[PDB]
Design a protein around this ligand. Structure first.
Ligand SMILES: C#CCN(Cc1ccc2[nH]c(N)nc(=O)c2c1)c1ccc(C(=O)N[C@@H](CCC(=O)O)C(=O)O)cc1
Ligand SMILES: C#CCN(Cc1ccc2[nH]c(N)nc(=O)c2c1)c1ccc(C(=O)N[C@@H](CCC(=O)O)C(=O)O)cc1
Ligand SMILES: O=c1[nH]c(=O)n([C@H]2C[C@H](O)[C@@H](COP(=O)(O)O)O2)cc1F
Ligand SMILES: O=c1[nH]c(=O)n([C@H]2C[C@H](O)[C@@H](COP(=O)(O)O)O2)cc1F
Lengths: 316, 316
């Protein structure tokens, strides 16, 4: 079945896992080291044992897949996953001056009155962004995010290398090469960023005509973060092979610290009260080949019958 | 037993492996994706089923572990593993002008007369290096090799980040962090190098006082290259914990393309005619703490009873 992978990763953590403090409060139960593997020939591992929502996953990928470091496309696609860091880079400073708000969010996962401000002054924020190009360009252009990492490596001699572009042009001409990597971890930049890229390195592979991919994710939350991650990189592979004219092999997903949060383990146990159903299947439009173009009307997920969605608290 | 890992990786390739052309002639049998794991508490995985030689492994590590991009320390330590690329960057050019030699080596693994030249003009090379500082500094300073990758990241704003230094100072103060990485893959530099770093990324981990490490190696030869690699990173971990005052956890070693060469598979089958013996145990001197200092008289391997060494041809 395609998603038993997750359920044996998540099972093995609350069984083998050993406790660690984190970079917040809530403890983690962590394993270090896992290869999880999915056979893309017969699927698209979006969890049938918990609604996970393909729409925000597509948007986010597509944002990444064509330069963007600016949340104004994400906002205007009803997606707000990367919304708050834009507010941290602003609540703090010199145009804004308003509410209490310096530090919000965690103290809004359980708040005071906070909800009508963290939700209403960072409403006004995300609004001005979508309509004020000036404002968009500043407090909504996040800088360094996977988008500028894959498509824009800033180099010691002035300019930017579009790495993923180059690896999709190697996939075509030179298929069998052991070099087919996109790193997202740049040292000049990591004694700095809010989050360093959690999705560090991913190499690709052809062999027999179908493209595998492997992703080393350095820090992974078992419950909330790992559902989107399997699916995104699975969506990213389906898209590279429709470009490079290849079939689908594997999506292999490796880990450093796969960790569960102690504040959401009653909830993972409830997910294991469910048996996986038949796995869903994606569609990508034939009339669009340069993967760089896809809108939402170019990737269709079909026949996803999920079990009810299970809620958990971003403490980060 | 600690090295059955290798023998089930190497077994699984000539069994599951599927054929691929490479960046040379000789075909490969390759798997893509493996986590291999060793429990350093009870060992030091140097193969007992084939002599592998700790001396050249120590030298090479130590070279790496204190700035060097120059083979004059490697030469003067009777090690010549990185010797020939120094000769390719020279056979080719303007001080040298001598023998036929432009392209040598492969055509010396099976040569014409080649042996008394590839071996005698690149004798004269490695000699002048060890005695002529001028010459050392040029045709023996390899530039970018793991040494300048770990200890010298060249940055867009002028200077060099000593990454490994910084990660050993984080290991001390902040132990439990999901950030403890040293990448060796720099994009500005990889549309270029002879070999891109085969040992791309490695993150570390404490938890309960003993340090694990995990290495994603992008391209690995099963037979010749993978023996040194398990041991080096195992030696590298033993050294970080004696610095950071930690015990030893695991050494986890992940793969992209683990591949065997078709020209050395009679030879791997002969290694599997042997049962592993008791695994060897290393020593690191108590009076030397800054790992940055170790000479050869600071790491002792004890009680390594190996099976005879099994020879195989560098075609690259
Ligand atoms: C990328 C990026 C930046 N971020 C920020 C961020 C903050 C805390 C985190 N916490 C955990 N455990 N994992 C994460 O991936 C994570 C990411 C993201 C923002 C939201 C979601 C997300 O949709 N969360 C839940 C929604 C339910 C809820 O909390 O109310 C989900 O659908 O699973 C994922 C990533
Ligand atoms: C690092 C680096 C650069 N290099 C260059 C280089 C060239 C061809 C290769 N071929 C293979 N299969 N794997 C490699 O790691 C490799 C590396 C190295 C040079 C020598 C050895 C080595 O000692 N080889 C054999 C020696 C026996 C022989 O060939 O006569 C061994 O001990 O296993 C390893 C790495
Ligand atoms: O440190 C090294 N490791 C390594 O394994 N090789 C070789 C053999 C390996 O199989 C190949 C990597 O494949 P590619 O041909 O893509 O470089 O280079 C060379 C080195 F310098
Ligand atoms: O893309 C992302 N992935 C991710 O998982 N996180 C979170 C949750 C994860 O557990 C943590 C990574 O650990 P660290 O605290 O070391 O950053 O950051 C945030 C993102 F933006």
């Amino acid at each position: 079945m395609l998603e038993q992978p997750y359920l044996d990763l998540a099972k093995k953590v609350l069984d083998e896992g050993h406790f660690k403090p984190d970079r917040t409060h809530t403890g983690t139960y962590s394993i270090f080291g896992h290869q999880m593997r999915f056979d893309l020939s017969k699927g698209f591992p979006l969890l049938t044992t918990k609604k996970v929502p393909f729409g925000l996953i597509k948007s986010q990928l597509l944002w990444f897949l064509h330069g963007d470091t600016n949340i104004r496309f994400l906002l205007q696609h009803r997606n707000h996953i990367w919304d708050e860091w834009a507010f941290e880079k602003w609540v703090k400073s010199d145009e804004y001056h308003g509410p209490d708000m310096t530090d919000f969010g965690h103290r809004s996962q359980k708040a005071p009155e906070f909800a009508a401000v963290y939700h209403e002054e960072m409403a006004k924020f995300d609004d001005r962004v979508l309509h004020d190009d000036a404002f968009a360009a500043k407090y909504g252009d996040l800088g360094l995010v996977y988008g500028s990492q894959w498509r824009a490596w800033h180099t010691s001699k002035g300019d930017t290398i579009d790495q993923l572009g180059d690896v999709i042009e190697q996939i075509k001409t030179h298929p069998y090469s052991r070099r087919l990597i996109v790193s997202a971890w740049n040292p000049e930049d990591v004694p700095t960023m809010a989050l360093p890229p959690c999705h560090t390195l991913y190499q690709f592979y052809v062999n027999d005509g179908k493209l595998s991919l492997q992703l080393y994710q350095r820090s992974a939350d078992i419950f909330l973060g790992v559902p989107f991650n399997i699916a995104s990189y699975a969506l990213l592979t389906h898209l590279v092979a429709h470009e490079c004219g290849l079939e689908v092999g594997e999506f292999i997903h490796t880990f450093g610290d796969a960790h569960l949060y102690v504040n959401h383990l009653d909830q993972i146990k409830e997910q294991l009260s469910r048996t996986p159903r038949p796995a869903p299947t994606l569609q990508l439009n034939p009339d669009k080949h340069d993967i760089f173009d896809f809108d939402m009307k170019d990737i269709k997920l079909l026949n996803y019958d999920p079990y009810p969605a299970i809620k958990a608290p971003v403490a980060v």
